[PDB]
Point group: C3
Chain length 214, copies 3
Amino acid sequence: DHGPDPENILPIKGNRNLQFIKPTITNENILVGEYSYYDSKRGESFEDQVLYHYEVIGDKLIIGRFCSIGPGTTFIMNGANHRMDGSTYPFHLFRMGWEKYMPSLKDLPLKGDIEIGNDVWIGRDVTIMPGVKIGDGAIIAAEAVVTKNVAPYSIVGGNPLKFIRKRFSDGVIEEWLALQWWNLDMKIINENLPFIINGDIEMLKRKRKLLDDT
Amino acid sequence: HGPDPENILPIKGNRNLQFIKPTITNENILVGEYSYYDSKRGESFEDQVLYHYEVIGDKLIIGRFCSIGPGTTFIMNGANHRMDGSTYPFHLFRMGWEKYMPSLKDLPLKGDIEIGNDVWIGRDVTIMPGVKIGDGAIIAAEAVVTKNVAPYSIVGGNPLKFIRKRFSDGVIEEWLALQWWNLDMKIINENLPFIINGDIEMLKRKRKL
Amino acid sequence: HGPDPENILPIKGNRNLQFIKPTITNENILVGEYSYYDSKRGESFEDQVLYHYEVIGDKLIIGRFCSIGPGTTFIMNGANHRMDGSTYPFHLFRMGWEKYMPSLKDLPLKGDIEIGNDVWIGRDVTIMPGVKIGDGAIIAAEAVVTKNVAPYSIVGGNPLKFIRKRFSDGVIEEWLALQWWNLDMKIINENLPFIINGDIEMLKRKRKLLDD
Ligand SMILES: CC1=C\[C@@H](O)CC(=O)Cc2nc(co2)C(=O)N2CCC=C2C(=O)O[C@H](C(C)C)[C@H](C)/C=C/C(=O)NC\C=C\1
Ligand SMILES: [Cl-]
Ligand SMILES: [Cl-]
Ligand SMILES: [Cl-]
Ligand SMILES: [Cl-]
Ligand SMILES: [Cl-]
Ligand SMILES: [Cl-]
Ligand SMILES: [Cl-]
Ligand SMILES: [Cl-]
Ligand SMILES: [Cl-]
Ligand code: NA
């Protein structure tokens, strides 16, 4: 039964900044898994960090489980991109006649969902651009601007984004990905926590094979 | 048709987005019509202009129909320290040190910051002293503009890197020749469908006409 | 001649620029005389030091005569997560998970942030854990200082890019040897014109050393 309640918005005692993200969600098209947290700068909500996010565009921000999201991380959804065929100036917003030129979505450089995997560590003041996919077990350095996709279990950073290194060998990465501990039962996760935490992936692999029954 | 460019808040119900020119209060800031600052929480465009001192006399110049995203910052020449020896500004602290005040030629001043027409500037861009940004350029959010940007190019990063030109040299040459931003508003309103869709062939046509 | 380095606000009418040393209250921070922080809104220098926990024991050391820009942040090692397996900080949430409290040896510590003398640090710079910045350096605004910075060099960008040395390697060696910032103020006052205009040759003479 060990562990915090993922429905608890403020699961750390005395801490008014660190929030479990899922039970704070109020808007639709934001799907965040359990235990993922946002460590706010000054109590702001995770949703306030989601920008240019309009229902009319229908783009989604999707985040998995057990993610660590640092203060000031911002998620720039698709409302940020201007029409780029002619002038970038948005005449229609000003109306008084120009409302005629309200653009159709097909004319916008739309990008699709922001998708973030599980067990992802996102540093302070990272900016995430529209359409970006970030793999399981990634680490994004502070102040990065995530301008392209991020491989699972990789470390990246900078503006624009440079790949830095792989966290483990490809064999070990493959095994973390076949393990998927974040999708296991909490009872199973607790049992395996010492090894999930110390990186004893060989042990985790044996416990997984043991349970196979296949 | 069109909003009044002297309207500080041209969109109804929107207290963040401001036409810049009717907000200008300070000297040496010259901004063209219809250019806007989409503020974060209503702060004024002027207060995004930093280290701007009259005794240096550098200017910030911005053309028409520019989109300036929230948190865009302009760093003027007052930011630069003397770089011959120590960068420490002894004179500021006086008490005898005021006599080490640098002359203007001691300082590495870099001139005016000039942004052209129809430039889209991303959220939280920082602009360095002396930078020239061409018409129709696009500056990606979070960029630190450390060097000049060509007309109709897309740039980004810290430091700034070239990403791509928006069109072929020929079409650009043609937009630059057209200079639609300097037409009368009656003519602009007439030609908006093609300014927006980039039908430059049609634009040359109607303008010859 | 010169201001009182213990005067927190050494410029008349200015409530933003602070001599840093007399504002320090925290352990594990040491900042040299005359170094200043030009705050955005009156915030203190210590408010710009982040993830600094005594139990980790990392130190922030800054030399003398440094110019520190508005918004400059110092990230110490309390931000580092364990990287052996999952980065998720289970122990924080307790309720059984506090038994997974890491040891300091489990954490990827970067050591102290050490900043030399006569350093110019631009606005909105971010300094990462364990970085060393040599004397006379210049860090461009908005830089993220991800690695060590050679003395009298210019750097910038995210991640940090080397730009150029300020002087020839010979002249840098001469500044480094002189260490004007450690000289008695009477001597520094006698030599200010040349410290400021960069005339190292003349500075060398004015000292009149034992090996002429
Ligand atoms: C950026 C910097 C220091 C900062 O890190 C801290 C500040 O910003 C605080 C500040 N600075 C000031 C008033 O508060 C201030 O008043 N400045 C700084 C901007 C011009 C003058 C000034 O003296 O003008 C004189 C003329 C009268 C000849 C010349 C231009 C001075 C130039 C100069 O020495 N640049 C060194 C840079 C100072
Ligand atoms: Cl902040
Ligand atoms: Cl994903
Ligand atoms: Cl391998
Ligand atoms: Cl903000
Ligand atoms: Cl006086
Ligand atoms: Cl502490
Ligand atoms: Cl407890
Ligand atoms: Cl160390
Ligand atoms: Cl060099
Ligand atoms: Na970069």
